[PDB]
Amino acid sequence: MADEATDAARNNDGAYYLQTQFTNADKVNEYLAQHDGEIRAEAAADPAVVAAKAALDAVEGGSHNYGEVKAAYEAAFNNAFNAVRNKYVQRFQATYNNATEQEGKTYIQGETPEQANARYLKRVGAANNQNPAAEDKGATTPASKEEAKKSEAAAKNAGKAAGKALPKTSAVKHHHHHH
User: Fold this and answer.
1) What SS3 class is residue 48?
2) What is the largest CA-CA distance in the chain?
3) Opening angle at CA 106, ends 101 and 111, nearest 5
4) What per-residue string of b and e applies to 82-120 under the rule 16 or more CB within 10 Å gives b?
5) What is the DSSP code string of 123-166?
6) End-to-end CA distance of the chain, in Å?
7) Taking a C-beta distance cutoff of 8 angstroms, is the pair 63, 2 a contact?
8) How far from the centroid of its chain's Cα atoms is residue 136's Cα?
9) Contact 48, 127 (CB under 8 A)
10) Which domain holds residue 84?
């Protein structure tokens, strides 16, 4: 069970270069979306990615070389997914330019903007070797451990009661009384 995968997703604008949808990138995304399956499968079937995941399941948690295989797995994944998506959109546009240009063009490049980012990521320092890795028991926010007891007291004050007094005596007898 040395595997755990919180798939949480990001259906949001994520252009490393357009930073939204600049230029005619809508028709790009439309294709990259329409074939997101074949693209994802190719990227996930790349020798670097299969090997890196299968090595991760053998070194996970933070086990030492973990940081390396983690960085390699990421690098190779993004690398591969970029490379497949790139090669397709490049073919697609340099076919669906039929009108004046790039029709039949076997002999000219195009490059892409994400390609300048993706160039940085290339590692294939393990290959071959593919076994399965997904079983995370869901783990959909466990509000385990939630309580707040408290039980306090204070302030006994400890006042006093009273003083003492006495009535006067009657050290008088008559009030003269002459005749």
Assistant:
1) helix
2) 159
3) 75
4) bbbbbebbeeebbeeeeeeeeeeeeeeeeebebeeebee
5) --SS-S----------------S---------------------
6) 126
7) no
8) 16
9) yes
10) 18-133
